[PDB]
Amino acid sequence: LDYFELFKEYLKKREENHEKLLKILDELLDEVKKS
């Protein structure tokens, strides 16, 4: 049910280089919350 949890799975199944992308996502999310 968790939007970003589901996204992470989705991305790993579509993007061989998913590690970098998810790193960036976490940074963005961190800033959104913290802001």
Binding site: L1, L6, Y10, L11, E15, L28, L29
Partner: protein
């Protein structure tokens, strides 16, 4: 969203009402014109600044009011925080005042919004849904029980997905992502170390852009998330149909076929093709399934007279499955003029002539 208290003065058919909500089931019972749907619309209006029956806010003022003024106070819990909305609607002066406060542990109140537009925006942010979503899913108006069921596919997907994601968060995330991209575009626009630095920036730009497409292009994650949501909700809905109809009726969603498609012993039927009572029974099963899957996000389930179309046997069946919800930490309210149905439930709130009795 867990309702806790509602106070109403001179709103629609209500003169003065002050009620406290409890977890489990309460049946609001009373005759035609008692004020039952007035209570329902007071909550909608308190939260979102609109009711159901009138497009014009001033029309919600009880026309019997000497001072021409409606007053609403609505207290609710969400995510471990407590909130209070106060509204005053003055039909004489054409003024609408509104405020939203957090109720702190000390019991004191701290305003976090003033004015109808800001109160609405902050409620949407807190609840994570818009008004249409609220009334199509778990807060079902009289005469509209089956509206989600017979809706076109684009409305269904917008509505059901809205329950499980925050547009405000996604909006902020998309803006932040874009600003980072623009900053890099600016920097890139204007030796071993330098070669590495330009590539680092190019790669980050391109990765942000890739992430942007997966996250925000409609055909990518959004489509998939919506599918995951529908699957979970329909899985539960099928289980209810199985029980309620002895294996006869099934439900699926198909955009090309026009939205919700029911199978009658295997034979496909647009939802709108179902009989009046069949649509009530299936819409209630879908709504009940949504309310269950949305626990934690939306902790209320109201149905305003979604029961009259049911024959004796289906009314009994429906009352039985609904009663199972009593065990949930959910504020559940059914509204009816019908004793045949209200008798199935223990706890009642009786209304007559615009007050509680």
């Amino acid at each position: 969203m867990r309702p806790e208290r509602l106070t109403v003065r001179n709103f629609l058919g209500l003169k003065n009402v002050d009620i406290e909500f409890q977890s489990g089931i309460t049946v609001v019972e009373g005759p035609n014109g008692a004020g039952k749907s007035s209570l329902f619309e007071a909550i909608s209006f308190a939260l979102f600044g609109n009711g159901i029956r009138y497009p014009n806010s001033y029309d919600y003022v009880n026309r019997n009011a000497v001072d021409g003024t409606a007053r609403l106070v609505f207290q609710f819990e969400r995510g471990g925080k407590r909130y209070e909305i106060i509204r005053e609607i003055n039909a004489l002066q054409r003024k609408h005042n509104a405020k939203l406060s957090e109720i702190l542990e000390n019991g004191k109140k701290a305003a976090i919004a003033a004015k109808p537009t800001s109160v609405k925006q902050e409620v949407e942010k807190i609840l994570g849904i818009e008004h249409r979503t609220f009334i199509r899913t778990v807060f079902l108006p009289q005469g509209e029980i089956d509206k989600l069921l017979i809706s076109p596919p684009s409305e269904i997907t917008e509505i059901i997905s809205d329950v499980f994601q925050s547009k405000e968060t996604l909006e902020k995330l998309e803006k932040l992502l874009k600003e980072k991209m623009k900053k890099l575009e600016n920097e890139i626009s204007s030796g071993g170390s330098l070669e590495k630095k330009l590539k680092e920036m190019s790669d980050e730009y391109n990765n942000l852009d890739l992430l942007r497409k997966y996250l925000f292009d409609k055909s990518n994650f959004s489509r998939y998330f919506t599918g995951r949501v529908l699957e979970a909700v329909l899985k539960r809905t099928k289980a209810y149909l199985d029980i309620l109809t002895n294996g006869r009726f099934d439900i699926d969603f198909d955009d090309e076929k026009g939205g919700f498609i029911i199978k009658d012993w295997g034979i496909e039927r647009p939802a709108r093709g179902l009989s009046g009572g069949e649509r009530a029974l299936i819409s209630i099963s879908l709504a009940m399934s949504l309310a269950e899957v949305a626990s934690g996000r939306l902790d209320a389930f109201f149905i305003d007279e979604g029961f009259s179309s049911l024959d004796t046997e289906n009314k009994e069946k429906i009352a039985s499955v609904l009663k199972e919800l009593e065990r949930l930490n959910k504020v559940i309210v059914f509204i009816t003029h019908d004793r045949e149905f209200s008798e199935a439930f223990d706890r009642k709130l009786r209304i007559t002539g615009g007050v509680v009795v």
